[PDB]
Amino acid sequence: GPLGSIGESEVRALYKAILKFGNLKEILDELIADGTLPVKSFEKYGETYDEMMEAAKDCVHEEEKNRKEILEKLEKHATAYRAKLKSGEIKAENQPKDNPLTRLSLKKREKKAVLFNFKGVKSLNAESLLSRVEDLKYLKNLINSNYKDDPLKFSLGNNTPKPVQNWSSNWTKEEDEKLLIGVFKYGYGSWTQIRDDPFLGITDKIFLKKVPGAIHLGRRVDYLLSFLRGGLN
């Protein structure tokens, strides 16, 4: 390791490449060749990757543990209040504006960010890193298990996605299949290469006042991989 250690600028660079390609330990040679990362030994980059994903896991487990203990308390207070309504001591058509049922609902619906600091770099998002790595590992294994000879034959079967009939172009189950084959080939966020691939045939259906643009495609991929893995339940 005579080329020096890993610093803040190399960290910022590793974080962006993971959000795009997932687990990147098998493509280190390619990321150095085009200047994305400066030259260090392969071992140093692998060890840093592992350390980052470990800090992300710990962060996510710690916050779930706290949320769960608070929800257990509010559920207990809510049970007591129900016996009061059924018996008449409080009246259902005349409840106080601040009550045990509104307190439970607020926490249940709460959406807050889960963040950590790494090697001088501040405010990395633990949930974004973990979801992206697991979603892209699922997509690679599904396609190699079933369509090894020719990825272009990939199909959704009877699994039925929510329609987008208000887009500018005509977008159906077949266009959803070609979009996921494109991410398997080129990475998350590579929308120009996906649009211009002549074999996928969606060149005229993407708009880089026209919808879909870059923001709509990102949201569509996050929804489709969550749904196939059973995450809507």
Q: Which helix (H) or strand (E) holds 125?
A: strand 124-125
What span, in angstroms and rounded, lies between the C-alpha atoms of 23 and 12? 16
Q: Please, what is the minimum distance in Å from the beta carbon of residue 169 to Cl ion?
A: 19
Task: Report strand pairing: 124-125 vs 115-116.
Answer: antiparallel
Residue 108: C-alpha distances to residues 100, 105, 112, 173 (Å): 13, 5, 12, 34
| Residue 8 Cβ vs Cl ion, minimum distance, rounded to whole Å | 17
126 or 132, CB closer to Cl ion?
A: 132
CB of 232 to Cl ion, least distance (A): 29
Residues found near Cl ion in the complex (CB under 5 A): 1, 3, 40-41, 190, 192-193
Q: Smallest distance from the beta carbon of 181 to Cl ion, in angstroms?
A: 15
Closer CB to Cl ion, 169 or 190, in the complex = 190
CB 118 within 8 A of CB 11: yes
Q: How many residues does the chain have?
A: 233
Residue 202: CB minimum distance to Cl ion, A: 14
Q: Which is nearer to Cl ion, 40 or 220 (CB)?
A: 40
- What does the alpha-carbon distance between residue 206 and residue 109 come to, in Å, rounded to a whole number? 34
Is 46 within 8 Å of 70 (Cβ atoms)? Answer: no
Closest separation in Å from C-beta 28 to Cl ion? 12
Nearer to Cl ion, 80 or 215 (CB): 215
Long-range contacts of 60-64 (CB under 8 A, 24+ apart): 60/114, 60/126, 60/127, 60/130, 63/114
Residue closer to Cl ion by CB (options 41, 146) is 41
Q: Is the dihedral of CA 127, 133, 134, 138 positive or negative?
A: positive
Identity of the residue, 113 or 214, whose beta carbon is nearer to Cl ion in the bound complex? 214
The tokens for 223 are 């929804």
